[PDB]
Design a protein around this nucleic acid. Structure first.
Ligand SMILES: [Mg+2]
Ligand SMILES: [Zn+2]
Ligand SMILES: [Zn+2]
Ligand SMILES: [Zn+2]
Lengths: 268, 171, 549, 93, 174, 84, 105, 98
RNA sequence: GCUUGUGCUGUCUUCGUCCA
């Protein structure tokens, strides 16, 4: 059934007739071998913990960035444009939290397979550039904001200037952009990871390159791979379950063995 | 009759010739392999117009054999006789079974059964000829004949002429 | 390059157009007419011309060339002959479709029972797919049980009542409601009547019915001339040193031809209708069973041994049929099979190959100016000394066998020749274990020639193969080209297959006593002396020569 | 080299190895097809260098193919049953 | 070997009588049909060539190739020897000999005027190019002779055949 | 008509693994058939190794033609495709 | 359908990546109705006759194709496998041309 | 004739016990008559009248001829049985079990 | 100068081997 299905050069998944099965393989265009379980940090935790972790206030002194971690802590307090930038970042984070918590993952599960491991990249940067010691960073906040914002626009899954292409490209990387913004927040970068400048450009370049390397290759015979990946477990394995239930599903049997409903009641 | 035709040729090139002079070499190979050949479908290809500015395109690598395949399109002058056509000729040989004439590259054989009876073959004449009272057709004599049939061979064309109708024979 | 030169251009198939064979085409493509039932002329060689083993049909003997193409046995594809049928017979595979077409049209005027005036009929004709178009037209015209000589103005019909057709074996019964109740007559619908009715179908009606005017004309579903396949399709087998056995298809064709002769003889001499019906029904049965011997509802045709006849349809179906058993998967050359064993001292992507298997298998290497010296050495060593060679192949394609050559040292290699050298170290080979459940069951290893007669694997790869060393066997396939070698080394190589796309986790890990020993060795209270540490450090291939404090 | 091995080779994406296994390391064959009728009825005589399809009465529009011998046998058995599989080397739309 | 720009031509069932080659009936077959297509697929007319036009074209192309092969630095024998291939050399020699020994018009301007007369004429706007080539080639002198040699012109009685023949004879160099 | 202009090429700018494998195989076969080598060979003798050396230096004289589902195609030179 | 398949697979603790089951359930529901994975589901498509006959009902499919004059465009992988051709898959999903411009160096 | 060697056969076409044999060697020599051709034209009695039907040893096997039995079948024709013996020493790949 | 020897059925059935 699935033999003649292949990823084409425009990203779509089509059969031999040219009929579209999917408009993007796996709905994200990634390869099955290039994903790993990662935690999205904006999903879990109470509102107070989220605010404490991500909010930065440049007017109140005790709710600001610590002065021993940044060289320029003197001329930061009282700035209003930089506060506008930080507020935009925090609003983006809150929107991501709402989108993930109310639409995608309603049950709050935050451990999902996603491309390019961010934790590994960050600790590699820390080991490479010797980011220990109480030395103060020279990484200005606008550089952080603009670098992350620009990075979230260079994750190309689809090439082209078409408006519909741009919309599909933006859709394809929503979860991954949420992950990246959750990890590379301003407060986390300056305090938790203590990256300097060179580490920051290295991290951005590495993220972009690894994402480009994790895409699916045109010419994959994904139908056969899917068929094998589904049939392989079946060889090693009151409701019906197991091979009889799989046979019922695949045959689309009209009268299954144990029909059932799952009626949910109102809140009261 | 001569014509202009747009023809195409498939040319296969060995990898040992994959050099900067690939295009010119393909051009001379095409010229050597097309000029003067005889195809029954088209007739005789005599010349290729614009022989030094022929587009060859991009060659495709044959999977499993390495050699590249080129599609060459060109315009050439082609001559082909047609059934029931009257053309000029020059007699090349005289024989009791008939005489052989030449119409360009084509050699046409005319049997005695397609020759007027008054043109009795004279073997005593020097050179021997098919002669009448007022007509004498020998080697090198201009003759106007009508092609009746054409025979297709592997790379050759055999035509049969006749002079038995009016405005034919010696000219 | 293994085929003799042919001036015709070499191209690849881009479309396969199906259809039926018109009797005109069968007569045109044929090369001889088959009429004599006797297979052999006088049992003195030289099979009878015009018989089932005519030499013009093709040659299956080494010393005999085909009389039609003049090519040898290895090149002759076989040529068809045709057999004229005395009376047309039904094609066993199209009887239901013939019945449906008879239901869709009138049996007298040869026109459709419905017209485009009906909105539903026009809607049905509007569709594109021939099968669905025919289904819709049949669903509509099935109810219409009477031809109309007038518009429902004359529509071209004859006004006759349409009979109801019922299937009974190979015979179709048509029941007319001849003129509340009266006496209706059901009479046999002979193939000839249906054929001459179908020939009067207009091309537009034929297109409306789903048939194609150029390729699949409805009256071609009735067989009037039979194509006789060449002996290549029905080869004979020598049962013993003296007596050879005729194939099943040959015997069935002999029976069909005998029935044809019987019908022709009976027709011209004297015609009792009962005898004619019996003999023509016998001919229909033979022709039908020649192409399908599993017709439900009637006994099968049996051989003199009692086994059922292997019809052409049975050749194509099942695991052992043509499609599954010879086209989708087939036996291949340049392969080996033996028991597997474990070797802790092999790299992950290495397989240990016995010397005898390495000598038997080969890889054709093109002679260039980078390897002519080495290849000459291999040619000198001969097919019994490793490293060696088995054949030398010239540019023209001729093979020089090095076993039977007395002047092997007197061979000079020219550029472009091929030397079928022995299998050597670091040659990529495909390695496989059945059943092949997933794509990690076929991986490409690097050859290492070793003594003794078992394949040897690093034990980490026993997990993807689902293999252990209690008697399992695995298959080895040798690539025979530079392109194929590159594909194996760049796509299927073992290191590239460590992480699987099924669950984005590795499929190979430390297993068995290596796992047990890495647990025991890394306990908190395991201490190692200097002299043992030196040996353990030297064992690491990637060690940099610095001993840790 | 059964069907499951063929599926594994498809999953790997190695088309060249699959073609070589099923043609060069097995029953490879050369046939001639008429460029008009599309049938394998060309009476080809390689030594005399003349090709000819009697049904279509042509000598020029003739091509050669490399197909498995089992495919040739299957097409001939189909022709034995009045089915005509026509092989064409160009698409039409 | 060489393939025409016309392809397809698959199997059918109808058979036509306008398939056999016949000069008198002006049935030149599919590859020599009145409508042709160039490399761009656009409409194109069948291009016949009289011996004058053919000689002019072959001489021009051969001398251009000879000049190109010598780095851009007249005799028919030398011009034939320019080409490669002994059989090709012989074929071009024979064609050149035929054209020279039957050249009705050896001048470019005479051929240009003849082509203009045979093309721009109102009567000749319907004449088939094969008929035009035959008229310019055979060098006929009489209406009856031309009709006998060219049966196609018999059905075209709207042609000023005699005066056109006299014009050709005038243009013919004596 | 079917060809896509260089300015409007929308496929990936990287050499996929299938394209890399096919290019290496074809180049190795061509070198084994005595094609000219466009890079200096120090001591290498294996055609596949020479092909890999050529590919690393962007010296392979081959063109990839990527077929879109509708029949149109894009021609990419192996010297302008990024290789990992 | 995805939920049921995942429930069957993950009952014994096994894990299969999402994209494979997504592809399967997108194939089963791509025609607007549930297409069973049987001969009555697969063989009732518009795919080539040669591809369809290789699965089940070979002879019946071949007769139906012959009577209906079906045309196979040889775009599938089974058609190219059984004809000994380079399938339009993997390394055969493109063409290699010769770069006459680069060879000028 | 078979490509093996016939030099180990005795006068009666049967190998004798105690002779070491290898793969493809001929252990039973048998011929079947064939109608002669026109070779009697000028052949000095050296024309083929019989066709070989010999029994070769299996290609992968070798050993010592242990015992040769010669007798008559139920029909009164000759009938032979040849038994070959070899020793198999354990080696890498042999299967054992408790 | 006496000169070296190339070829194999087929169809059933059963019993086994390794996975499952
Ligand atoms: Mg085991
Ligand atoms: Zn033959
Ligand atoms: Zn009627
Ligand atoms: Zn034909």
């Amino acid at each position: 059934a699935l033999e003649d299905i292949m990823v084409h050069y425009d990203g779509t998944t089509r059969n031999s007739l040219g009929d579209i099965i999917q408009f993007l393989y796996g709905e994200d265009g990634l390869d099955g071998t290039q994903v790993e379980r990662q935690t999205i940090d904006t999903i879990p935790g109470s509102d107070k913990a989220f605010h404490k972790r991500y909010y930065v206030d440049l007017m109140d002194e005790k709710n600001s960035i610590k002065p021993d971690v940044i060289e320029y802590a003197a001329d930061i307090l009282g700035d209003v444009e930089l506060q506008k930038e930080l507020n935009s970042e925090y609003e983006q984070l809150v929107s991501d939290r709402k989108f993930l918590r109310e639409i995608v993952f309603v049950n709050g599960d935050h451990n999902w397979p996603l491309p390019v491991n961010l934790r590994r990249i960050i600790q590699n940067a820390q080991q490479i550039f010797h980011l220990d010691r109480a030395k103060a960073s020279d990484l200005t906040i606008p550089e952080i904001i603009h670098g992350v914002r620009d990075l979230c626009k260079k994750l190309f899954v689809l090439r082209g200037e078409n408006e519909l292409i741009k919309e599909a490209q933006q859709n394809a990387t929503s979860l991954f952009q949420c992950l990246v913004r959750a990890r590379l927040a301003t407060r986390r970068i300056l305090e938790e990871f203590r990256l300097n400048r060179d580490a920051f450009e290295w991290v951005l370049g590495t993220i972009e390159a690894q994402f480009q390397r994790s895409l699916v290759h045109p010419g994959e015979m994904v139908g056969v791979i899917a068929a094998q990946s589904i049939g392989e477990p079946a060889t090693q394995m009151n409701v019906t379950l197991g091979v009889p239930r799989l046979k019922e599903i695949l045959n689309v049997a009209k009268n299954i063995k144990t029909p059932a409903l799952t009626v949910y009641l109102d809140r009261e | 009759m001569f014509f202009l035709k747009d023809l195409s040729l498939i040319l296969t090139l060995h990898p040992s010739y994959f050099g900067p002079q690939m295009n010119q070499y393909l051009r001379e190979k095409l010229l050597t392999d097309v000029e003067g050949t005889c195809t029954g479908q088209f007739g005789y290809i005599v010349t290729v117009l614009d022989g030094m500015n022929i587009d060859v395109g991009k060659g495709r690598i044959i999977p499993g054999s390495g050699s590249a395949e080129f599609e060459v399109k060109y315009r050439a002058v082609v001559w082909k006789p047609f059934k029931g056509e009257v053309v000029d000729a020059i007699v090349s040989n005289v024989s009791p079974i008939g005489f052989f004439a030449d119409v360009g590259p084509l050699n046409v054989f005319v049997s005695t059964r397609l020759i007027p009876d008054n043109l009795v073959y004279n073997p005593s004449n020097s050179p021997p000829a098919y002669m009448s009272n007022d007509e004498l057709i020998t080697k090198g004599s201009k003759v106007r004949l009508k092609v009746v049939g054409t025979r297709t061979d592997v790379n050759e064309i055999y035509a049969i002429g006749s002079i038995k109708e009016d405005f034919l024979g010696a000219i | 390059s293994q085929f003799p030169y042919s001036s015709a251009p070499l191209r690849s198939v881009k479309e396969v157009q199906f259809g039926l064979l018109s009797p005109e085409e069968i007569r045109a493509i044929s090369v001889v007419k088959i009429e004599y039932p006797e297979i052999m002329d006088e049992s003195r060689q030289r099979p009878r011309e015009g018989g089932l083993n005519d030499p013009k049909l093709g040659s299956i003997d080494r010393n005999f060339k085909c009389q039609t193409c003049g090519e040898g046995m290895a090149e002759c594809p076989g040529h068809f002959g045709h057999m004229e049928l005395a009376k047309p017979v039904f094609h066993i595979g199209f009887i239901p479709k013939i019945k449906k077409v008879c239901e869709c049209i009138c049996m007298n005027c040869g026109k459709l029972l419905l017209d485009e005036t009906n909105p539903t009929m026009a809607q049905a004709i509007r569709i594109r797919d021939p099968k669905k178009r025919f289904n819709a037209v049949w669903q509509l015209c099935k109810t219409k049980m009477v031809c109309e000589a007038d518009a429902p103005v004359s529509r071209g019909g004859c006004g006759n009542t349409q009979p109801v057709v019922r299937k009974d074996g190979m015979k179709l019964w048509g029941t007319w409601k001849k003129s509340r109740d009266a006496q209706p007559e059901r009479k046999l619908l002979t193939p000839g009547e249906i054929l001459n009715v179908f020939k009067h179908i207009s091309p537009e009606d034929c297109f409306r019915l789903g048939f194609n005017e150029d390729y699949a004309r409805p009256e071609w579903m009735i067989i009037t001339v039979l194509p006789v396949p060449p002996p290549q399709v029905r080869p004979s087998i020598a049962m013993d040193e003296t007596t050879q056995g005729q194939d099943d298809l040959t015997h069935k064709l002999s029976d069909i031809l005998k029935a044809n002769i019987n019908v022709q003889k009976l027709e011209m001499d004297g015609s009792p209708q009962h005898i004619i019906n019996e003999v023509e029904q016998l001919l229909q049965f033979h022709v039908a069973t020649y192409m399908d011997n599993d017709i439900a509802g009637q006994p099968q045709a049996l051989q003199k041994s009692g086994r059922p006849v292997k019809a052409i349809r049975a050749r194509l179906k099942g695991k052992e049929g043509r499609l599954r058993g010879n086209l989708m998967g087939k036996r291949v050359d340049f392969s080996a099979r033996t028991v597997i064993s474990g070797d802790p001292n092999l790299e992950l992507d290495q397989v240990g190959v016995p010397i005898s298997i390495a000598k038997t298998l080969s890889y054709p290497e093109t002679v260039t100016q980078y390897n002519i010296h080495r290849l000459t050495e291999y040619v000198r060593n001969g097919p019994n000394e490793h490293p060696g060679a088995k054949y030398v192949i010239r540019d023209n394609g001729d093979r020089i066998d090095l076993r039977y050559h007395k002047r092997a040292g007197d061979i000079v290699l020219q550029y472009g020749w091929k030397v079928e050298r022995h299998l050597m170290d670091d040659d990529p080979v495909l390695f496989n274990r059945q059943p092949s459940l997933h794509k990690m069951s076929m991986m490409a290893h690097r050859v290492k020639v070793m003594p003794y007669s078992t394949f040897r694997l690093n034990l980490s790869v026993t997990s993807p193969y689902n293999a252990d060393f209690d008697g399992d066997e695995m298959n080895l396939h040798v690539p025979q080209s530079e392109e194929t070698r590159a594909e194996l080394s760049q796509l299927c190589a073992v290191p590239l297959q460590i992480v699987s796309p099924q669950s984005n986790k590795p499929v190979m890990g430390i297993v068995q006593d290596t796992l047990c020993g890495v647990r025991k060795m890394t306990l908190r209270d395991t201490f190692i002396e200097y002299e043992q540490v030196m040996n353990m450090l030297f064992w690491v291939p990637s060690w940099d020569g610095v001993v840790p404090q | 080299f059964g069907e499951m091995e063929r599926d594994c080779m498809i999953a790997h994406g190695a088309a060249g190895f699959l073609k070589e296994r099923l043609m060069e390391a097995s029953d490879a064959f050369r046939v001639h097809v008429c460029g008009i009728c599309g049938l394998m009825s060309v009476i080809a005589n390689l030594k005399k260098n003349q090709f000819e399809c009697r049904s279509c009465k042509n000598k020029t529009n003739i091509y050669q193919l490399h197909i498995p011998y089992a495919a040739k046998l299957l097409f001939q058995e189909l022709m034995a049953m009045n089915i005509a599989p026509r092989l064409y080397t160009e698409r039409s739309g | 070997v060489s393939t025409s720009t016309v392809g397809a031509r698959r199997r059918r069932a109808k058979q036509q009588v306008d398939d056999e080659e016949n000069a008198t009936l002006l049935r030149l077959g599919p590859e020599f049909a009145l409508k042709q297509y160039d490399h761009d697929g656009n409409e194109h007319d069948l291009i016949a060539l009289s011996l004058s036009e053919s000689r002019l074209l072959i001489r021009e192309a051969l001398k251009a190739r000879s000049r190109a092969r010598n780095g851009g630095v007249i005799d028919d024998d030398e011009l034939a020897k320019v080409t490669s291939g002994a059989v090709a050399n012989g074929v071009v020699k024979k064609t050149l000999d035929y054209l020279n020994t039957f050249a009705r018009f050896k001048d470019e301007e005479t051929c240009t005027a003849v082509d203009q007369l045979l093309h721009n004429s109102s009567d000749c706007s319907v004449l088939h190019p094969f008929e035009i080539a035959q008229l310019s080639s055979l060098g006929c002198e009489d209406v009856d002779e031309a009709i006998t040699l060219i049966p196609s012109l018999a059905a075209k009685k709207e042609v000023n055949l005699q005066r056109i023949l006299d014009e050709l004879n005038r243009l013919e160099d004596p | 008509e079917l060809a896509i202009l260089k300015e409007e090429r929308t496929t990936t700018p990287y050499l996929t693994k299938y394209e890399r494998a096919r290019i290496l195989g074809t180049r190795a076969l061509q070198i084994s058939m005595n094609a000219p080598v466009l890079v200096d060979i120090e001591g290498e003798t294996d055609p596949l190794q020479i092909a890999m050396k050529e590919l690393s230096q962007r010296k392979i004289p081959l063109v990839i033609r990527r077929y879109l589902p509708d029949g149109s195609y894009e021609d990419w030179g192996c010297d302008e495709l990024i290789v990992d | 359908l995805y939920k049921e398949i995942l429930n069957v697979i993950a009952f014994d603790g096994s894990y299969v990546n999402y994209r494979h089951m997504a592809l399967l359930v997108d194939v089963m529901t791509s025609r607007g109705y549930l297409m069973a994975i049987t001969r009555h589901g697969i063989n009732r498509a518009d795919t080539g006759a040669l591809m369809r006959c290789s699965f089940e009902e070979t002879v019946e499919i071949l007769f139906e194709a012959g009577a209906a004059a079906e045309l196979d465009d040889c775009r599938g992988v089974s058609e190219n496998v059984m004809l000994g051709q380079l399938a339009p898959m993997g390394t055969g999903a493109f063409d290699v041309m010769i770069d006459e411009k680069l060879l000028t160096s | 004739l078979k490509h093996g060697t016939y030099e180990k056969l005795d006068e009666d076409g049967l190998i004798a016990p105690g002779v070491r044999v290898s793969g493809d060697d001929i252990i039973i020599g048998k011929t079947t008559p064939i109608p002669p051709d026109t070779e009697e034209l000028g052949q000095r009695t050296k024309y083929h009248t019989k066709r070989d039907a010999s029994t070769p040893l299996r290609s992968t096997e070798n050993g010592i001829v242990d015992q040769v039995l010669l007798t008559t079948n139920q029909e009164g024709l000759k009938f032979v049985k040849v038994r070959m013996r070899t020793t198999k020493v354990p080696q890498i790949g042999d299967k054992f079990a408790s």
